[PDB]
Amino acid sequence: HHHNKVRTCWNEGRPALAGWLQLPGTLHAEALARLDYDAVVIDMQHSPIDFGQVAPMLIAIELGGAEPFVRTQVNDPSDIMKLLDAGAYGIIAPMVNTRAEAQTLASALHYSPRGLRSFGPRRPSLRYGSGYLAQASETVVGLAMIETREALANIDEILSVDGIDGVFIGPTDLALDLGHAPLVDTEEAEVVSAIAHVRERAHAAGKRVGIFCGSGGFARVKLAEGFDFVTAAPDLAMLSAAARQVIADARAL
Amino acid sequence: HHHNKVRTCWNEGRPALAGWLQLPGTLHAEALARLDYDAVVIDMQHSPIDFGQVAPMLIAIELGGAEPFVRTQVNDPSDIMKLLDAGAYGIIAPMVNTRAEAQTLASALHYSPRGLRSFGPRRPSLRYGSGYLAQASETVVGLAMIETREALANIDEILSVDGIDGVFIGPTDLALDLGHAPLVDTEEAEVVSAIAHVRERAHAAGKRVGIFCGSGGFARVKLAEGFDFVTAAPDLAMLSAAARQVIADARAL
Amino acid sequence: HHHNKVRTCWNEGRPALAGWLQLPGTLHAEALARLDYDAVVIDMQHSPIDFGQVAPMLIAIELGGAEPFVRTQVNDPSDIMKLLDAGAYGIIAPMVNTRAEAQTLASALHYSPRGLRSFGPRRPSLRYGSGYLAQASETVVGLAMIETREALANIDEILSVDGIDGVFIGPTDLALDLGHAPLVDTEEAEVVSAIAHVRERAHAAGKRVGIFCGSGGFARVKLAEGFDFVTAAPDLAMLSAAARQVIADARAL
Amino acid sequence: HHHNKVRTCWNEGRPALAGWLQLPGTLHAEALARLDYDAVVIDMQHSPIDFGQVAPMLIAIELGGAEPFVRTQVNDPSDIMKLLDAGAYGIIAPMVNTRAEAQTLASALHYSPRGLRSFGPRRPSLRYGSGYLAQASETVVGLAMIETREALANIDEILSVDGIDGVFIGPTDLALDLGHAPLVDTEEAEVVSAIAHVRERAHAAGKRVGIFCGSGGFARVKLAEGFDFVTAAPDLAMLSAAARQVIADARAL
Amino acid sequence: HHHNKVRTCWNEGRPALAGWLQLPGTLHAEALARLDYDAVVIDMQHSPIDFGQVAPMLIAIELGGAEPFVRTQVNDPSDIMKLLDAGAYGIIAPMVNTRAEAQTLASALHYSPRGLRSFGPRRPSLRYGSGYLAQASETVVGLAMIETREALANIDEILSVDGIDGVFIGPTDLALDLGHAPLVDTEEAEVVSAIAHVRERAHAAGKRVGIFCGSGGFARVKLAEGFDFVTAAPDLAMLSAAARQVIADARAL
Amino acid sequence: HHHNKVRTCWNEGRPALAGWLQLPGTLHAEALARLDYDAVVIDMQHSPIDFGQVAPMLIAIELGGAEPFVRTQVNDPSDIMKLLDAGAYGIIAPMVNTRAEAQTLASALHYSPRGLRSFGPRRPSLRYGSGYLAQASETVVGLAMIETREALANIDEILSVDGIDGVFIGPTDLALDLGHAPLVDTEEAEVVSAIAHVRERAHAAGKRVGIFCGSGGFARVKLAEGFDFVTAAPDLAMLSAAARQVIADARAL
Ligand SMILES: [Br-]
Ligand SMILES: [Br-]
Ligand SMILES: [Br-]
Ligand SMILES: [Br-]
Ligand SMILES: [Br-]
Ligand SMILES: [Br-]
Ligand SMILES: [Br-]
Ligand SMILES: [Br-]
Ligand SMILES: [Br-]
Ligand SMILES: [Br-]
Ligand SMILES: [Br-]
Ligand SMILES: [Br-]
Ligand SMILES: [K+]
Ligand SMILES: [K+]
Ligand SMILES: [K+]
Ligand SMILES: [K+]
Ligand SMILES: [K+]
Ligand SMILES: [K+]
């Protein structure tokens, strides 16, 4: 338990595949973490998961053997710091549209002098022991979300920020801001082109790029295109679709 | 909202198909209730769902448009009464092995003189209004679980109990008590024979019979065999299987 | 804080008036406890209040200056003991129909040798300090509910049980068991006669008698009749009625 | 369930009357929603109601048949977005003192291009179905609170903001900022004059105006004066007053 | 994680030392589990810890590296089964006074044919994988508490019950039932003699014996006397004592 | 209960000693409040304690007889206001680095005209009664944390802010920002010198100064040096250390 599993993937030359949870609770969190996911992201933006509910989920994901990540409600330093101290080891912050906002994200992820993270690592100290402080930055992964035309306009400046590992595309909001339907795994040409451009710029910068996916097949293609961090697919969406199919099968003549 | 949707299926000559939840929370409960399920059963036996977590789930299922059912942890009258008053409108009680235990279940489901249910129907009174008391028995469905060789031995006496609608087979415990593996949707001959026998005896008694299913295809066959109430399939099992397949698809060459 | 406020009323020659809560939460609990109520009863039978929600409510009632009481879901010794150790100082147990059931209630309320209460008084020890054990019995009030024709039949035997202070009439269930509507504050002659009889028998036995009331005027009359413990009226009922009147006043021409 | 009940009142030429909850929990929320309230506002500013407790309350209000509204703790976009995605369909934001702050509120309530609301409408999509995005703005009501002399000074500029329906007066804070006692339903002339002025300016702008009321009679007068959205009265205040009166009636000679 | 750490101690010829938690929450649970405790017992009898709060604590203890145990509120089969399925791997049941009560405890801990445990091992299946059923009995430790003169009278019959590992002395209740003060780590001769007798009888029966301790020094002596399972000391007691000493040190001249 | 216990210490010429809680829950909160602590600080920054969990803890601390304080996650006005209205009577805000940030803290603590605190004091009104508004400022203590080189640089300007009582040193973050290990109770000369300087400047300004301590002996020395508010020591740290010692004592030969 003495390495961030996602950073280990990267250091060993492979991308990371992560789950995505919008449903609160520990039981499915542990169960999915025990599958061949490198990380499980808990969504605190588009879900009813508040801090009180995320906290035990982090424990359950770690026990199950995946790295606990959180997609926060907002890029707020103190919110992020409190998640880090509760044992979130990856942070995906929404709506990072400028270099300054990316610097605000980075500031929360590193103790002085690299950042201004406040010191009181209740759960990381239990995981990593006495040597935590010297390795703390490496234990956390940080990605800025790219979800607007403004973020696209500022992508090179965002990617130039030290202390974030790279960017995570939110393609539904991106489609909407471009005037298209917010369809997951879209084929809309302007959105597909923007996604490819963000990936190309991130790799030109020597940074990591991730993307939210709605299906296993789309995730496979994103991995083939070279994305470093791919999520697939939300618990609620997979569960709904599975139940709809069970009903169709049960009710068929 | 002025009828129990499962009793309406039966009264209109069709069986009922129900979901099965072992994961706490309201969001997937509502989402699954809005699918073509007549009822959604919340499992309080083989899950971490306690009373505090079941209570909002009942609300969410009703809002979504399925009848809220609970499979209780135990056949205990006061537990059942408190669920009824919180807006559980179907009760499946585990480990009903004798006529006396079936009578104990029935006692909880009916006000005097048919039973001894205590009066204080906080949520049913809001749903049904001033005429609730006169229709209360019809608003609730009750099924005794058949899960042991003892329950099999006593099946005709259990089915003779007034004030339960019938029985619900728990085929994993039944297999185990017969010395076989607790495989859902089993083909083991002795278990399949016992299941068919329970159904035959329930219908000979003019009662309803249900069964827990692990798949849509098995549920379809159970409906074809004449089961009146079929559950398919647990949220956690469907979600796990869906995630495992998404991972396999994403990681494939 | 070194006396049970209800026992102090009795010892000083006056009855006790108590509130009644079916809504979970601490804020209204404290607010009502600060009114001229001697006790506030938290209903864990006909409400969604589970142990996790009752526990902080007990604290809030004590801070507000009323004695915290609980009407339990069932007459179960271990449930009652855990409430006592969480700082419930009055227990009203439903559906006590026989002397044996009354003895079961009494057993939970007293340490050996008078009863079999298990020792680990987390919150009473904080309230009462080192001398708690020697005074423990006096710190708790216990009342058996009388809610059925069977309990009426056995009233003298129930009242003969040492280690309960007396009985608490539940007049809605009593009406129902007699074949009448479960109207609070009923005028139905057979119910009114049964209520008076229970009071007379309790006083002939030198015991205390209480009754659940739905209105202040009915409570006043019950106090005038000599009831020792009167509750009036449920939070939810008072709040509903108040809101209905505010709406009528607001929407009037 | 395919319209916002408050907007329907307005579209049909009538004002809306709403409840106001400072007590957490679902049971009174549903019960009050089933009364003749068009909406029920949950107060997350002057209450102990956090996100974890508001979430089930929204479900309960909708089931009961009133539109779920929230008065937030602060005018924060991401907080508001997460409430919208949990099924809050009306937002009242405190302490909106400038046009810029009003624009910040409006930004959270509309998807691009009218605003920057992030896309992931977990509960609205369940309520409204596939056509949600095209109707999303109409499904939500937004009101900026007017609670300071500064907000009074800027009232015309605040009212000029597209994408909020209007303003909601908080008359206790307004009184305090003017140097008067924070009495609900005040008669203090300067406060009464400021309230009338805000209403007049809102109607001159073709916008809606609301006000918090402490009594049914005051609410009736506010409706007669032409307020479009009137709240009356807080659950805790109504419950306290009702209990105080029950005690007075019970303890009277 | 594929063995019960307490059974491993025993199988390797050493006793087990366990912590004892009366405070709800995961953070101290994990922290104490990471110390040199073989197990951590969560007290659900003399604490405010309900099922909803115990569930995440079990996860946290396992992550920290101690075996999660529960001292239940009561010897109730269905309560115990639900704890087992939530990942409690040791059960200490209070107030086991007869062989029949010991048989009731054993019945809950073993699948058929050795017992009647119901099948649905949500969390054990995640821990132990597909081979769980064949090893399930070995994964769980069960101890009956000896806390009364009656249990002392029946000690040999209790120890003769197959399917419990042995007994756990509760010396405060035992002292009380003998008419002595309920002092932890008592020197009262009759209590000390009864404790020694229970240990001697348990070892004569080839069974395990445990005892609750209030201090490290007493625990050391109990280990030297040959107790197989020693708890020391309750979180709340240790924390209180530590705080009292910090205050005394801070306030000293 | 009609005075802030910490302000009473100061008014009577003595410093205040306070506890420090990072573990959620009411039982240890009450127990520690009943010790000779003037206040108990609940840490909402470096802990998993969210609003839903802090709220009952405030009640428990007040019942136990210490003043409830909160160290917030961030210096945010609306967060602070909601804590005040839930009965936090002392606020310690982290990372106050400039006079403007100190003014933002002060603004939240006082009603107009001294500040802009919003009016709706649910719990203070219950504690203090009708005269609350006129005494509200005195009922609350506010301290700005000094945790960075920037805050050191701006210490005199921070201390010049009306409406905060003074400053609270966070010496672990301060050490880190100076390039030293974040050891509690440090002897590192530059940190010790900075701490003394902050105290000297606070007293030159006629203000109060506090410091977080990790031990009773260090706290004693800080009191001797003239600190006005000393915390010692975190619940989790004291509990861990106590358990480690119990284990060492139990396992010793
Ligand atoms: Br897998
Ligand atoms: Br999706
Ligand atoms: Br469907
Ligand atoms: Br299954
Ligand atoms: Br009063
Ligand atoms: Br009533
Ligand atoms: Br109405
Ligand atoms: Br009001
Ligand atoms: Br250790
Ligand atoms: Br102890
Ligand atoms: Br002390
Ligand atoms: Br420390
Ligand atoms: K994994
Ligand atoms: K449905
Ligand atoms: K009182
Ligand atoms: K309505
Ligand atoms: K360990
Ligand atoms: K104190």
Author numbering:
A (entry chain A), B (entry chain A), C (entry chain A), D (entry chain A), E (entry chain A), F (entry chain A): -1 to 251
Mind quoting what the paper says about this structure?
Here structural analysis of hydroxyketoacid aldolase from Sphingomonas wittichii RW1 (SwHKA) revealed a dynamic movement of the metal cofactor between two coordination spheres without protein scaffold rearrangements. In total, holo‐SwHKA contains six equivalent active sites; each of which is formed from amino acids from two different domain‐swapped dimers. The transition from M2+ R to M2+ A,S is induced by bidentate substrate binding and occurs without a concomitant rearrangement of the protein scaffold.
Notably, the formation of the overall hexameric assembly of apo‐SwHKA does not seem to require the presence of a metal cofactor. Crystals of WT apo‐SwHKA and mutant variants thereof were soaked with MgCl2 or MnCl2 to afford the holo‐enzyme. In the absence of metals, wild‐type apo‐SwHKA and apo‐S116A displayed similar melting temperatures (T m) of approximately 66 °C, while variant S116C showed a slightly lower stability of 62 °C, which suggests no substantial disruption of the protein fold.
